[PDB]
Amino acid sequence: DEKRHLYEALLRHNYFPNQKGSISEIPPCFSSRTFTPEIAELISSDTSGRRSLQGYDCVEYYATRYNNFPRTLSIIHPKAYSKLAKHIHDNWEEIRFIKENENSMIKPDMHADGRIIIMNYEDAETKTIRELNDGFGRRFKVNADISGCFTNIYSHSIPWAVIGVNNAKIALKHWSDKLDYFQRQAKRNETHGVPIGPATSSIVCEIILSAVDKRLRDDGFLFRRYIAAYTCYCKTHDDAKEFLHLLGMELSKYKLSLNLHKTKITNLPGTLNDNWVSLLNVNSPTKKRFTDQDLNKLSSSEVINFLDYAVQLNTQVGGGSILKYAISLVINNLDEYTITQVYDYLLNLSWHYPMLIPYLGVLIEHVYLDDGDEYKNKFNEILSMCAENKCSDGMAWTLYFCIKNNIDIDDDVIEKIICFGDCLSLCLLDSSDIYEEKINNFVSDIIKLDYEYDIDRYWLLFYQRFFKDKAPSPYNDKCFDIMKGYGVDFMPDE
Amino acid sequence: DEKRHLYEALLRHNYFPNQKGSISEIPPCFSSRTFTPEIAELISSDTSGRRSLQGYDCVEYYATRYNNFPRTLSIIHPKAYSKLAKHIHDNWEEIRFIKENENSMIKPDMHADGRIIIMNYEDAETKTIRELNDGFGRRFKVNADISGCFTNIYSHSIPWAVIGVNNAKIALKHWSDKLDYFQRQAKRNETHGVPIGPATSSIVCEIILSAVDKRLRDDGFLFRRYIAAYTCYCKTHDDAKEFLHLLGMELSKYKLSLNLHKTKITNLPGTLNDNWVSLLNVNSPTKKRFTDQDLNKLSSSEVINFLDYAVQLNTQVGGGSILKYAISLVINNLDEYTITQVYDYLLNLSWHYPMLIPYLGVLIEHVYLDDGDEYKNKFNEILSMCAENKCSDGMAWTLYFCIKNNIDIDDDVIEKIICFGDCLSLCLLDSSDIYEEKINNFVSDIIKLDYEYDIDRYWLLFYQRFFKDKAPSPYNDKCFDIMKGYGVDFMPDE
Amino acid sequence: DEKRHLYEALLRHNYFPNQKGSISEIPPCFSSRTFTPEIAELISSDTSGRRSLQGYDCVEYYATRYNNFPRTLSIIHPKAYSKLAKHIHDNWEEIRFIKENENSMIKPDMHADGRIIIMNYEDAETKTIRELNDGFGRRFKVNADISGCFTNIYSHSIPWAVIGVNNAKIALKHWSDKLDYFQRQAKRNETHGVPIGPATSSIVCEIILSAVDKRLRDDGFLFRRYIAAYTCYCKTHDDAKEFLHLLGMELSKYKLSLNLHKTKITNLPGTLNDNWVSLLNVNSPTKKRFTDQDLNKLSSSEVINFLDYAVQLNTQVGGGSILKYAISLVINNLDEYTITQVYDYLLNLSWHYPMLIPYLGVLIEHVYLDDGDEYKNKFNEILSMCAENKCSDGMAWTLYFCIKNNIDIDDDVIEKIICFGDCLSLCLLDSSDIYEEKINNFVSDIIKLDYEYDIDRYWLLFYQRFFKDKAPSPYNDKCFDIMKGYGVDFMPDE
């Protein structure tokens, strides 16, 4: 069924931040499968325990963007998440109108892997045909962005999108009001904001933005939405300015607004992709597939020169993720002579740009890591940099490389891994079991605070220790106990 | 013979604007062959009829350049053209000194197809060797342009070029005076200007500019002429400024002048082609021929990315016809998977740039045009745009595609095709025979004016209707009758 | 042995300016082998003759850089050079500490060909791995240059580097003091400067700069030296400014200084090579080797378009030797159809850029030089340009092409070859033997001056005439006689 596929997707696949489909933002050690929908029903049914704080906090995760900026992905506390996912499942026949929207490019969809939200998933041919087809006969292309979107979505506006603003205000139960309550329970009983990364917040965002899409559609606008980005194709500048006005009205009705540093009108014909994308692909040494693998295999100077050219292009343009695109272009066709050179270049690029650390997972088997302890000092210097810059995805990926490849990790860099206080980093140090006593000091400092929001901020670490019998639950409810009795592990093996 | 080849070329091949050798400016439905030299002799011999207006007007044709600018090509009225071509033929032993000029790159020449004027015809190897050989040892490259050339060539200066200015002024018969008269009869008995596109005006321009070439040659200048463009190679800046001075004097003697927005001195070594040409060819995915066709066949992403890069390069440089060069680079090596994608990209580019419409004639058989009437609305939206922008070559090419592929054409776009009043468009609508009555209203409005110049502006439409027996001749002379009796058709089949 | 290999290298291989390893700065007609170490010992042992001038002058050679700037390479007078080379040989166990330095990239080393100093010699893979390895984890890259280095190295500071500044000042014999004296005797008994091109001056420069390298090393700086260029990799800007301060102190202690027009701090990650290098290599049509030679063979338009793109890139960037790199990329894979076109393009580029003349030695066999005397006028027009611009390497290479290919050379260009007064040019005219009498006038004007420094400036011409029995020695010492008796020829055959 599609209800069952959504129920699997909300918990087994898209609970953790898993929207990016090329490389994940979270290392593959952390997996949310075995958190089955029946365990979510049992958690929702459980009513024990008393909480002194309204709502639940989230395990935080600062992922690095192309400009090294942090984006705070969140792992919802699972007692607050099981109710939210179960509510979205039970109400799916009244929610699936977001699937029938045609202006939302990334939306819930029955993906084969098990997910429902995968950004940048559709193939290049259809994307090109759509871009030309919608750019047919038009003069201007308007790009608009919602300012926060994740930051300031109003949860009380979830019924406003569903049955209208004034009908919902008069009505103040209906399914969308309980959805608003359950979404609020996900993040500290707070009206504004949604945790970034779970598909439940993507569904909540799609529900609110589908009314905006409906009103923009009914006024005859050619437009597409990519999460919070609206692209409009306009025969004249009348359409260009009036779409911006109508989008501003429709967002302001649901308390949202437009990012005016991201608004720009560009005369068609522009570029189907961004300009740096075609600059890289035109100069890519892999741009032609030769149908024989020896020809497809690249040389040392070819890959290195393309990587230098990508570095200059990112310094000179910087409009997008130039390094990640360029590295994905050359990463899978490396010859054995290249692997050490491109590996060290990736070490250089991963230090300077910590979002490039996941690509280091491709080469680690082919590179002989023992060497003369060069890579040993490299990964620790990266770990120190990720501790310094407060970057969670680079820290977690580097620690996944350190435990998976058994490379030792220094004490002084751990002094800042423990002091940074990223939860997912501390779960990796927790799964190592060598640093049991520095982990114990941190969790004891959390418990001695007697602040439930800090325990909810480190719920993944606390649950991993409780499931590994190294600690008891810090909660008086049965949620951790129902998780552990059924075998829920958020750091599972194969 | 060469006299006979010129006589064929003036009427069968280069009567209509046919100078461009890669893609024609006029669709292949309009062909000037079967207008044989014997029919031209019979037209010249005929002396019947009375005309109230001095001279004849021309069928006008606004072709689109690389910057979307119109250039008004002209189809000379054939009673005024037969006399001109016959006069140039009879006097060819006194005209062929323009063929012996060595500084005129495009000039009358015995081409194999049947033409005598083909711009951009010589191969790249000789052009490169000439450019290096003439750039041997020199410091500066001067580029100069005649301002109007076609716009303000003085017809009375045709004998001035032939026998000298003062000798011709004292002489005021010689063959060049009758050539001046016959050239004036081509365009409304007007002294200034030549109809752009016939080879007779190219011969007239070469006759006048050969004296300029002779004087510049005798003063020891290394220079080449491309229609109205002079390139000079200079050992110092003394040569650079003095060539500009002498060219200004020699043009001002024959009443011409220099385009001073097109004058520029560039220090050698510059670029053999223009800079965007090498930028495209260096980045072209077809730049290396592999001697096997599967390797020569291109992929989807390769062609699309090169086309986006060409769009950015034209937006960023714009110095030449970047899109046409880039499309000619990739057009003939398309794989079957590409054809729909590159076709839609060409639809996007043809709408924005109407000179790119002729390339749509390459792909139309390989594209299944029935579809879901998408291409049906595309070609009509292009037709509306060409009606709006007053672009004749895009209109004529799109109509040639519409009749040849049998795709239907809307009434409201025809409301502006009839209102634009391009003659060659109305001959396509005339050959369709569905819109017989809107054509009849236009020609009746022309005839009711009783202005012979408007009848001469639509002589091709009037002759096509008269030859198809749908209308009588609007002329009291026998020229149309001698044309029709011998079977002259300007819209012939095979 | 390594002492013997150095002794061979100082005289047989690196006496003449031979540091560049791709194409030499001096044509292959001039070779310093057969000037064996035993002849150097016999010259050093000889004590006859009286000289009225202190020291010896050098045969001068203005080589053209990438910006057409002259660099004055010098061929040391061999009586002053044999003593210097023999002194460096005898003291090699006290000099070889410059070989153990790890921050000097170009230094004495046992090369296979016979040299000890070859700049730009190490392979690209190690250079890339070193550049990434030293750029590991750092924020800034400091580039610094010694201002003159060759121009103002203080010879009295040779013992200052060897045993310390104050110890050497108090000591005022030790081996480094006699090295300072012998280095002074090389150039006119002058304290400042070293003749550029002999390896003895490279050894003298390495001796002085190794103390700077030692002090910079002991203060924990990651830095590399390329002759006179220091590159430093810095974790912060504290290291960046403090390295510049310490390098300025260490150079000022040995009387040197920093080129402050060549000092710049660039945030890593920059470019491993320069930016134009990756721009050329990414756009190079030879960037992928196909393992079959027909595929590796290039077409006409491909090479010509890459050469035009290189010309624009050098006009637009100009940061390095863009033309020489681009030509070396395509020079060895030319197809037979290309050779004439790329040859004429190289003629164009050699005229405008005289450092590109040596590449003309690759193509001269494949090009049929007889033709219609086109290349005959080309090489003479180049010879006139090299005479005009006072460029010695272009003159010498063009004359090597003229004598080797037997192409005639005009009298009026020889009027300026004789008037320029480059010594190596006059040795080529001397070896031709046709122009025996214009050579005789020049050497008689030199001898009538009775200035020993001019005779030392043309010692190579004087020795070549004396060894060819066309003239007697202009020296009262036996050095020329011991050279000729053992068969020393500086223009030898095979």
PDB file of N, CA, C and O in Angstrom, chain C residues 422-466:
ATOM      1  N   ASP C 422      76.389  41.014 -30.202  1.00  0.00           N
ATOM      2  CA  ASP C 422      76.277  39.812 -29.392  1.00  0.00           C
ATOM      3  C   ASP C 422      77.396  38.855 -29.760  1.00  0.00           C
ATOM      4  O   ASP C 422      77.653  38.625 -30.942  1.00  0.00           O
ATOM      5  N   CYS C 423      78.069  38.303 -28.750  1.00  0.00           N
ATOM      6  CA  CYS C 423      79.229  37.464 -29.028  1.00  0.00           C
ATOM      7  C   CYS C 423      78.826  36.157 -29.697  1.00  0.00           C
ATOM      8  O   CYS C 423      79.413  35.779 -30.715  1.00  0.00           O
ATOM      9  N   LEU C 424      77.805  35.477 -29.163  1.00  0.00           N
ATOM     10  CA  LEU C 424      77.418  34.166 -29.679  1.00  0.00           C
ATOM     11  C   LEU C 424      76.867  34.251 -31.097  1.00  0.00           C
ATOM     12  O   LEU C 424      76.989  33.291 -31.865  1.00  0.00           O
ATOM     13  N   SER C 425      76.255  35.378 -31.452  1.00  0.00           N
ATOM     14  CA  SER C 425      75.839  35.603 -32.832  1.00  0.00           C
ATOM     15  C   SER C 425      77.054  35.687 -33.749  1.00  0.00           C
ATOM     16  O   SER C 425      77.074  35.113 -34.849  1.00  0.00           O
ATOM     17  N   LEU C 426      78.084  36.400 -33.293  1.00  0.00           N
ATOM     18  CA  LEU C 426      79.287  36.567 -34.091  1.00  0.00           C
ATOM     19  C   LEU C 426      80.088  35.277 -34.179  1.00  0.00           C
ATOM     20  O   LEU C 426      80.798  35.074 -35.160  1.00  0.00           O
ATOM     21  N   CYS C 427      79.971  34.381 -33.195  1.00  0.00           N
ATOM     22  CA  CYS C 427      80.577  33.061 -33.366  1.00  0.00           C
ATOM     23  C   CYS C 427      79.852  32.209 -34.399  1.00  0.00           C
ATOM     24  O   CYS C 427      80.500  31.407 -35.077  1.00  0.00           O
ATOM     25  N   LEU C 428      78.540  32.376 -34.560  1.00  0.00           N
ATOM     26  CA  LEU C 428      77.837  31.674 -35.630  1.00  0.00           C
ATOM     27  C   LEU C 428      78.231  32.223 -36.998  1.00  0.00           C
ATOM     28  O   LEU C 428      78.523  31.456 -37.930  1.00  0.00           O
ATOM     29  N   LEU C 429      78.276  33.555 -37.118  1.00  0.00           N
ATOM     30  CA  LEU C 429      78.772  34.173 -38.348  1.00  0.00           C
ATOM     31  C   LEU C 429      80.234  33.817 -38.598  1.00  0.00           C
ATOM     32  O   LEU C 429      80.672  33.716 -39.750  1.00  0.00           O
ATOM     33  N   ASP C 430      81.000  33.625 -37.527  1.00  0.00           N
ATOM     34  CA  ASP C 430      82.387  33.203 -37.619  1.00  0.00           C
ATOM     35  C   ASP C 430      82.504  31.772 -38.124  1.00  0.00           C
ATOM     36  O   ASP C 430      83.400  31.468 -38.917  1.00  0.00           O
ATOM     37  N   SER C 431      81.619  30.884 -37.673  1.00  0.00           N
ATOM     38  CA  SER C 431      81.679  29.492 -38.107  1.00  0.00           C
ATOM     39  C   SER C 431      81.168  29.334 -39.532  1.00  0.00           C
ATOM     40  O   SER C 431      81.464  28.328 -40.188  1.00  0.00           O
ATOM     41  N   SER C 432      80.374  30.295 -40.020  1.00  0.00           N
ATOM     42  CA  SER C 432      79.922  30.211 -41.409  1.00  0.00           C
ATOM     43  C   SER C 432      81.081  30.361 -42.394  1.00  0.00           C
ATOM     44  O   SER C 432      81.113  29.673 -43.421  1.00  0.00           O
ATOM     45  N   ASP C 433      82.034  31.252 -42.096  1.00  0.00           N
ATOM     46  CA  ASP C 433      83.256  31.609 -42.844  1.00  0.00           C
ATOM     47  C   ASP C 433      83.002  32.419 -44.114  1.00  0.00           C
ATOM     48  O   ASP C 433      83.977  32.797 -44.776  1.00  0.00           O
ATOM     49  N   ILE C 434      81.753  32.705 -44.486  1.00  0.00           N
ATOM     50  CA  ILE C 434      81.507  33.602 -45.613  1.00  0.00           C
ATOM     51  C   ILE C 434      81.808  35.048 -45.228  1.00  0.00           C
ATOM     52  O   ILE C 434      82.425  35.780 -46.018  1.00  0.00           O
ATOM     53  N   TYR C 435      81.485  35.446 -44.001  1.00  0.00           N
ATOM     54  CA  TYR C 435      81.563  36.833 -43.560  1.00  0.00           C
ATOM     55  C   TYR C 435      82.807  37.067 -42.714  1.00  0.00           C
ATOM     56  O   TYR C 435      82.753  37.766 -41.698  1.00  0.00           O
ATOM     57  N   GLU C 436      83.924  36.479 -43.142  1.00  0.00           N
ATOM     58  CA  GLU C 436      85.232  36.533 -42.502  1.00  0.00           C
ATOM     59  C   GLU C 436      85.746  37.959 -42.330  1.00  0.00           C
ATOM     60  O   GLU C 436      86.417  38.269 -41.341  1.00  0.00           O
ATOM     61  N   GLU C 437      85.391  38.849 -43.257  1.00  0.00           N
ATOM     62  CA  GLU C 437      85.942  40.195 -43.278  1.00  0.00           C
ATOM     63  C   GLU C 437      85.154  41.195 -42.450  1.00  0.00           C
ATOM     64  O   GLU C 437      85.749  42.162 -41.964  1.00  0.00           O
ATOM     65  N   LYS C 438      83.847  41.005 -42.276  1.00  0.00           N
ATOM     66  CA  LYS C 438      83.106  41.846 -41.343  1.00  0.00           C
ATOM     67  C   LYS C 438      83.375  41.427 -39.905  1.00  0.00           C
ATOM     68  O   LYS C 438      83.312  42.251 -38.985  1.00  0.00           O
ATOM     69  N   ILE C 439      83.655  40.139 -39.697  1.00  0.00           N
ATOM     70  CA  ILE C 439      84.084  39.648 -38.392  1.00  0.00           C
ATOM     71  C   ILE C 439      85.449  40.230 -38.037  1.00  0.00           C
ATOM     72  O   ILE C 439      85.703  40.623 -36.886  1.00  0.00           O
ATOM     73  N   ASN C 440      86.336  40.308 -39.035  1.00  0.00           N
ATOM     74  CA  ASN C 440      87.691  40.807 -38.826  1.00  0.00           C
ATOM     75  C   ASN C 440      87.680  42.279 -38.437  1.00  0.00           C
ATOM     76  O   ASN C 440      88.469  42.702 -37.587  1.00  0.00           O
ATOM     77  N   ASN C 441      86.780  43.068 -39.031  1.00  0.00           N
ATOM     78  CA  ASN C 441      86.659  44.474 -38.656  1.00  0.00           C
ATOM     79  C   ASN C 441      86.222  44.626 -37.206  1.00  0.00           C
ATOM     80  O   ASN C 441      86.743  45.482 -36.479  1.00  0.00           O
ATOM     81  N   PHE C 442      85.285  43.786 -36.759  1.00  0.00           N
ATOM     82  CA  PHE C 442      84.801  43.869 -35.384  1.00  0.00           C
ATOM     83  C   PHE C 442      85.892  43.485 -34.391  1.00  0.00           C
ATOM     84  O   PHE C 442      86.106  44.179 -33.387  1.00  0.00           O
ATOM     85  N   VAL C 443      86.602  42.382 -34.654  1.00  0.00           N
ATOM     86  CA  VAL C 443      87.628  41.953 -33.705  1.00  0.00           C
ATOM     87  C   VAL C 443      88.818  42.907 -33.732  1.00  0.00           C
ATOM     88  O   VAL C 443      89.480  43.117 -32.712  1.00  0.00           O
ATOM     89  N   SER C 444      89.095  43.524 -34.888  1.00  0.00           N
ATOM     90  CA  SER C 444      90.146  44.533 -34.944  1.00  0.00           C
ATOM     91  C   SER C 444      89.752  45.794 -34.190  1.00  0.00           C
ATOM     92  O   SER C 444      90.605  46.418 -33.553  1.00  0.00           O
ATOM     93  N   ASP C 445      88.472  46.173 -34.237  1.00  0.00           N
ATOM     94  CA  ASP C 445      87.999  47.290 -33.424  1.00  0.00           C
ATOM     95  C   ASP C 445      88.094  46.968 -31.937  1.00  0.00           C
ATOM     96  O   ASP C 445      88.341  47.861 -31.118  1.00  0.00           O
ATOM     97  N   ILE C 446      87.876  45.703 -31.573  1.00  0.00           N
ATOM     98  CA  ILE C 446      88.017  45.295 -30.176  1.00  0.00           C
ATOM     99  C   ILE C 446      89.480  45.364 -29.739  1.00  0.00           C
ATOM    100  O   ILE C 446      89.800  45.891 -28.666  1.00  0.00           O
ATOM    101  N   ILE C 447      90.388  44.841 -30.567  1.00  0.00           N
ATOM    102  CA  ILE C 447      91.806  44.790 -30.205  1.00  0.00           C
ATOM    103  C   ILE C 447      92.417  46.189 -30.181  1.00  0.00           C
ATOM    104  O   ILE C 447      93.234  46.506 -29.307  1.00  0.00           O
ATOM    105  N   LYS C 448      92.009  47.060 -31.113  1.00  0.00           N
ATOM    106  CA  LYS C 448      92.548  48.416 -31.171  1.00  0.00           C
ATOM    107  C   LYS C 448      92.142  49.240 -29.950  1.00  0.00           C
ATOM    108  O   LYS C 448      92.827  50.207 -29.596  1.00  0.00           O
ATOM    109  N   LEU C 449      91.050  48.852 -29.283  1.00  0.00           N
ATOM    110  CA  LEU C 449      90.641  49.518 -28.051  1.00  0.00           C
ATOM    111  C   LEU C 449      91.675  49.338 -26.945  1.00  0.00           C
ATOM    112  O   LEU C 449      91.835  50.220 -26.092  1.00  0.00           O
ATOM    113  N   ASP C 450      92.373  48.195 -26.946  1.00  0.00           N
ATOM    114  CA  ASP C 450      93.328  47.800 -25.903  1.00  0.00           C
ATOM    115  C   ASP C 450      92.667  47.777 -24.526  1.00  0.00           C
ATOM    116  O   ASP C 450      93.275  48.122 -23.511  1.00  0.00           O
ATOM    117  N   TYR C 451      91.402  47.369 -24.497  1.00  0.00           N
ATOM    118  CA  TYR C 451      90.645  47.170 -23.269  1.00  0.00           C
ATOM    119  C   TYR C 451      90.455  45.668 -23.111  1.00  0.00           C
ATOM    120  O   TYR C 451      89.803  45.032 -23.945  1.00  0.00           O
ATOM    121  N   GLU C 452      91.044  45.101 -22.055  1.00  0.00           N
ATOM    122  CA  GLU C 452      90.978  43.657 -21.859  1.00  0.00           C
ATOM    123  C   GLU C 452      89.567  43.180 -21.546  1.00  0.00           C
ATOM    124  O   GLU C 452      89.246  42.012 -21.782  1.00  0.00           O
ATOM    125  N   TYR C 453      88.711  44.059 -21.020  1.00  0.00           N
ATOM    126  CA  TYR C 453      87.354  43.642 -20.681  1.00  0.00           C
ATOM    127  C   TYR C 453      86.511  43.399 -21.928  1.00  0.00           C
ATOM    128  O   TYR C 453      85.646  42.522 -21.928  1.00  0.00           O
ATOM    129  N   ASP C 454      86.752  44.149 -23.007  1.00  0.00           N
ATOM    130  CA  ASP C 454      86.054  43.867 -24.261  1.00  0.00           C
ATOM    131  C   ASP C 454      86.538  42.568 -24.897  1.00  0.00           C
ATOM    132  O   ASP C 454      85.734  41.808 -25.459  1.00  0.00           O
ATOM    133  N   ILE C 455      87.837  42.287 -24.798  1.00  0.00           N
ATOM    134  CA  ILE C 455      88.363  41.009 -25.262  1.00  0.00           C
ATOM    135  C   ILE C 455      87.777  39.868 -24.443  1.00  0.00           C
ATOM    136  O   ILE C 455      87.484  38.792 -24.970  1.00  0.00           O
ATOM    137  N   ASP C 456      87.566  40.091 -23.148  1.00  0.00           N
ATOM    138  CA  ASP C 456      86.915  39.079 -22.326  1.00  0.00           C
ATOM    139  C   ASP C 456      85.426  38.972 -22.633  1.00  0.00           C
ATOM    140  O   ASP C 456      84.837  37.902 -22.464  1.00  0.00           O
ATOM    141  N   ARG C 457      84.804  40.066 -23.071  1.00  0.00           N
ATOM    142  CA  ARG C 457      83.413  40.023 -23.503  1.00  0.00           C
ATOM    143  C   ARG C 457      83.241  39.252 -24.800  1.00  0.00           C
ATOM    144  O   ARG C 457      82.150  38.735 -25.060  1.00  0.00           O
ATOM    145  N   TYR C 458      84.281  39.190 -25.629  1.00  0.00           N
ATOM    146  CA  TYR C 458      84.226  38.425 -26.872  1.00  0.00           C
ATOM    147  C   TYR C 458      85.251  37.298 -26.893  1.00  0.00           C
ATOM    148  O   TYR C 458      85.746  36.931 -27.964  1.00  0.00           O
ATOM    149  N   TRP C 459      85.603  36.775 -25.711  1.00  0.00           N
ATOM    150  CA  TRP C 459      86.562  35.676 -25.613  1.00  0.00           C
ATOM    151  C   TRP C 459      86.120  34.446 -26.385  1.00  0.00           C
ATOM    152  O   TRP C 459      86.970  33.721 -26.900  1.00  0.00           O
ATOM    153  N   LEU C 460      84.816  34.175 -26.465  1.00  0.00           N
ATOM    154  CA  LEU C 460      84.373  32.993 -27.200  1.00  0.00           C
ATOM    155  C   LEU C 460      84.626  33.149 -28.693  1.00  0.00           C
ATOM    156  O   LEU C 460      85.119  32.221 -29.342  1.00  0.00           O
ATOM    157  N   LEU C 461      84.324  34.327 -29.241  1.00  0.00           N
ATOM    158  CA  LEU C 461      84.627  34.610 -30.641  1.00  0.00           C
ATOM    159  C   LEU C 461      86.128  34.575 -30.905  1.00  0.00           C
ATOM    160  O   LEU C 461      86.581  33.978 -31.892  1.00  0.00           O
ATOM    161  N   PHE C 462      86.912  35.188 -30.014  1.00  0.00           N
ATOM    162  CA  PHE C 462      88.362  35.226 -30.178  1.00  0.00           C
ATOM    163  C   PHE C 462      88.967  33.830 -30.104  1.00  0.00           C
ATOM    164  O   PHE C 462      89.841  33.478 -30.905  1.00  0.00           O
ATOM    165  N   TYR C 463      88.498  33.013 -29.159  1.00  0.00           N
ATOM    166  CA  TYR C 463      88.996  31.651 -29.039  1.00  0.00           C
ATOM    167  C   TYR C 463      88.573  30.792 -30.217  1.00  0.00           C
ATOM    168  O   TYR C 463      89.332  29.923 -30.650  1.00  0.00           O
ATOM    169  N   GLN C 464      87.359  30.994 -30.734  1.00  0.00           N
ATOM    170  CA  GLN C 464      86.926  30.204 -31.882  1.00  0.00           C
ATOM    171  C   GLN C 464      87.756  30.532 -33.116  1.00  0.00           C
ATOM    172  O   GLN C 464      88.154  29.624 -33.860  1.00  0.00           O
ATOM    173  N   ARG C 465      88.051  31.817 -33.333  1.00  0.00           N
ATOM    174  CA  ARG C 465      88.930  32.187 -34.440  1.00  0.00           C
ATOM    175  C   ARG C 465      90.349  31.664 -34.232  1.00  0.00           C
ATOM    176  O   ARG C 465      90.995  31.219 -35.187  1.00  0.00           O
ATOM    177  N   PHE C 466      90.856  31.720 -32.996  1.00  0.00           N
ATOM    178  CA  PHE C 466      92.211  31.237 -32.735  1.00  0.00           C
ATOM    179  C   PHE C 466      92.309  29.724 -32.902  1.00  0.00           C
ATOM    180  O   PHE C 466      93.302  29.214 -33.433  1.00  0.00           O
TER     181      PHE C 466
END
